[PDB]
Amino acid sequence: VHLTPEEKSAVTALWGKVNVDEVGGEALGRLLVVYPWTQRFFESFGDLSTPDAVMGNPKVKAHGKKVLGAFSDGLAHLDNLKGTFATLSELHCDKLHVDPENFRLLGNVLVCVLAHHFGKEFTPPVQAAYQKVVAGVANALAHKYH
Amino acid sequence: VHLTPEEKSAVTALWGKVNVDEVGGEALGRLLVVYPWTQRFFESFGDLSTPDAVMGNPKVKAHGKKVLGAFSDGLAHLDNLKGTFATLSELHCDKLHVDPENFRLLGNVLVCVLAHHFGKEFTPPVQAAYQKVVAGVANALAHKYH
Amino acid sequence: VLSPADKTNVKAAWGKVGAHAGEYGAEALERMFLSFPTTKTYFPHFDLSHGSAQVKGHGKKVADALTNAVAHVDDMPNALSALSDLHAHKLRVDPVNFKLLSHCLLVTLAAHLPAEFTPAVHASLDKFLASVSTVLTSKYR
Amino acid sequence: VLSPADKTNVKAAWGKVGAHAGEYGAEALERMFLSFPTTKTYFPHFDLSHGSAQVKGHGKKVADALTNAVAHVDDMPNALSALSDLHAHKLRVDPVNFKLLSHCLLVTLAAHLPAEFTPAVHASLDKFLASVSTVLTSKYR
Ligand code: HEM
Ligand code: HEM
Ligand code: HEM
Ligand code: HEM
Ligand SMILES: [Xe]
Ligand SMILES: [Xe]
Ligand SMILES: [Xe]
Ligand SMILES: [Xe]
Ligand SMILES: [Xe]
Ligand SMILES: [Xe]
Ligand SMILES: [Xe]
Ligand SMILES: [Xe]
Ligand SMILES: [Xe]
Ligand SMILES: [Xe]
C-alpha cells in the first residue's frame, strides 16, 4: 500500500506525459457512460442522452478538468494524501453528498484510460503503482466522512 | 484512533458477557454454513455436510474457540490492531494462504451471532462500535499480505 | 438461486416477523446509518436521528417491498420492477450499498428471532436478500 | 442483462483479440497478481514468475473460456456449466476476486485495443465480464 521509491518514480514519470485536461474529460465521461448511475450528480450538465453526448458534453469535460487537476496536484503529496484531501473530503461528504464508492469507480476508469492512452507503456508493475495511488486518493477523499 | 469513548465502553461492556469459546464455535460454524465456499480451508475437519453437522463438529468448535480467543486478546489493544495481529497476519498469508476477504465474512457472521445471542441489548450504537472493531481486526490481519 | 428449502425458510422467518415488519425495516435503516455512515449520503433531506418519522416511514416502505418479494418469490423481477426502475433511473444508489442494508436487515432479524434465526435460516435469508439486491440493481446499466 | 448492442460490441472486440487470447489472459493474470496480491492466495502451488509456463497455460484456459462465452453469449449458463461447477464445488474462490480479475482483463483489453476500446465498448466489456463472473459464481450456495 506504501509506494516503493521505484513505484513513486514510475508514477511521476508516466504522469509527466499526461494531458490532464484531456485525460480528465475522458475519465469523467467514461465514468458516466460505464457506470451511468454516477450521472445522479450531474442533472444540471445538460445532454447525457448517449455515450457520444456524455463524451462531447463541455460541462462534463470542465468537471473532468477540475477533478483531475486536483488529483494531479495531489500526486505531489503521496506521503500526505489524507492531509492534502481533508477539506475536499469534508466538502464531498457535508455539501456534495458523494458516496465514496464513486471515487473507487473513477479510480477504475482512470486506470483503464491510462492503459488505453499509454498501451504497452502501462506495464503490469506501472499499473500496480497506479492502483496504490487511486486506492490512496479514494481513501483520502473518504477519510473525513461521518 | 477510530473508536470513540462511548464505543470502546460499549465494546468492553458487551464482551464481558461473551463466552468466547461458545461464541467462537457458533461464529465459525455459521461462516461455514452461510458461505460454504469457506470450507476450502478446513478439508481435514471431518463432516461438514449439513448445517447440523457443521455446528456440532468438534474440530469446528475447537478452532472457533482458538480464533475468537485471539480476537478477544486483540480487544485489549484497540489502538494497536496492526501490531497486535502482525504475526498472525504473516501466518495467514505465508503459511495458510487465506484470502483476507474471509476475515470480513467472519466479521459479518460474528455481528449476526452477537445480535442473535444478545437480542435487544445489541443496539444500533453497540453494533456500530462492533462494526468498527471487526473492520479494524480484518484490516490488521490483512496488513502483512504481499 | 433460491432452493425450495430457502423459500420455506424465508417465508417461515418473515411469517414470524408479521406485523413488526415496518418497525424492523426502520431499525435496519438506523443500524445502516450508524454502522456505515457513507449510506447517509443518499438521505441529505432526511432527519436521521433515532425515532425519526422519515426513517420509520421509509422503513415501512422497505419492509412492504420485502413482503411483496417474499409473496412473489418465484416471480421477483416483475414484483420489484417499478422499484428496479426507481433505483436504476432516479435514486441511483451505488450497488455496493445494497449489501450494507442486507447485512443490517439480517442483523435486525437476528436481534428479533431467537428461535427462528438458525444457521440454515440465516443462510437462506442472506441468499434471499442478495437476490432482492440483484433484482433492484438489475437495470442500472 | 447484456443488451443486443453489448453482444455486438463484445463479439467485435474479442474477434480482434483473436490469436492473442492466450497472451492476453496471461498478462491479465499477472496484472492481477501484482496489483491485487491477495489473489495470489489462490495460487500458492504455482510458479507465478514473469513468463512462467503455468501462468501462460492458465492464461490460455481463461482466454478460451471467455471465447466460449462470447460465442454462446445468449446462453452462458449452459456454456460455462462445467466451469461454474468447478469454481463452486472445488476451487471455491471468494466471489470478490472475480471483480479484480475482471478489472485486470479490462485493463489488458484497453492496453491492446487502442482502436476498438471506445466508451461504449468499455461499458459493454465491463458488463460482459460482470455477467461471466455472475455465471461462474451462480452455484456457490
Ligand atoms: C480524483 C477524485 C476527485 C477529486 C480530486 C475531486 C475534486 C473536486 C474539486 C477540486 C471540486 C471543486 C470543489 C470546489 O468548488 O471548491 C469538486 C466538486 C465536485 N465534485 Fe469531486 N472530485 C473527485 C471525484 C468526484 C466524483 C467521482 C464525483 C461523482 C461521480 C464528484 C462529484 C463532484 C460534484 C457533484 C462537485 C460540485 C461541482 C460543481 O458544483 O460544479 N467528484 N471535486
Ligand atoms: C478473527 C479473525 C481470525 C483470527 C484472530 C485467527 C487466528 C488464528 C489462530 C490463533 C490460529 C492458530 C490456532 C492454533 O493455535 O492452533 C489460526 C489458524 C487457522 N486459521 Fe485463522 N483466524 C481468523 C480468521 C480466519 C478465517 C476467517 C479463516 C478461513 C475461513 C481462517 C483460517 C485458518 C486456518 C485454515 C488455520 C489453520 C487451522 C488448522 O490447523 O488446520 N482464519 N487462526
Ligand atoms: C433491501 C433493499 C432495498 C429495498 C427493498 C428498497 C426499497 C425501497 C422502497 C419501497 C422505496 C420507496 C419507493 C416509493 O414507494 O416511493 C425506496 C426508496 C428509496 N431508497 Fe431504496 N430499497 C433498498 C435499498 C436501498 C439502499 C441500500 C439505499 C441507500 C443506502 C436506498 C435508498 C433509497 C432512497 C434514498 C429512497 C427515496 C427515499 C425518499 O426520498 O423518500 N435504498 N426504496
Ligand atoms: C473471468 C473469470 C474466470 C474465468 C473465465 C476462469 C476460468 C478458469 C478455467 C478455464 C480454469 C481451468 C479449468 C480446467 O482446468 O478445466 C480455471 C481454474 C482456476 N481458477 Fe478460474 N476463472 C475465472 C476467475 C478466477 C479467479 C478470480 C480466481 C482467483 C483469483 C481463479 C482461480 C483459479 C484457480 C486457482 C484455478 C485452478 C488452476 C490450476 O490449478 O490449474 N479463477 N479457471
Ligand atoms: Xe514500477
Ligand atoms: Xe481516485
Ligand atoms: Xe470465530
Ligand atoms: Xe473479524
Ligand atoms: Xe426477508
Ligand atoms: Xe427486517
Ligand atoms: Xe431512511
Ligand atoms: Xe483475454
Ligand atoms: Xe497460474
Ligand atoms: Xe471478453
Side-chain angles (χ1 to χ4, degrees), chain C residues 14 17 20-28 59 62-63 66 101 104-110 112 129:
Chain C
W14 203 241
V17 167
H20 308 281
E23 182 204 334
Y24 299 176
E27 178 178 336
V62 171
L66 289 170
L101 180 56
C104 292
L105 286 160
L106 261 191
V107 170
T108 304
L109 273 35
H112 279 109
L129 297 165

Side-chain angles (χ1 to χ4, degrees), chain A residues 37-97:
Chain A
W37 57 97
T38 61
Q39 301 178 20
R40 76 190 308 273
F41 301 103
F42 308 113
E43 71 182 321
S44 74
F45 277 26
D47 185 8
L48 306 175
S49 65
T50 64
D52 283 353
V54 172
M55 297 315 291
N57 188 304
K59 290 168 171 198
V60 172
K61 289 172 154 180
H63 194 56
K65 295 178 193 188
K66 183 182 285 169
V67 169
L68 249 269
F71 180 87
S72 188
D73 291 345
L75 296 181
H77 294 103
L78 287 169
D79 41 6
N80 180 40
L81 289 181
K82 290 186 202 213
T84 295
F85 288 106
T87 306
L88 280 180
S89 177
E90 299 175 340
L91 178 76
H92 284 75
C93 173
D94 293 338
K95 298 305 185 168
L96 311 173
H97 315 294

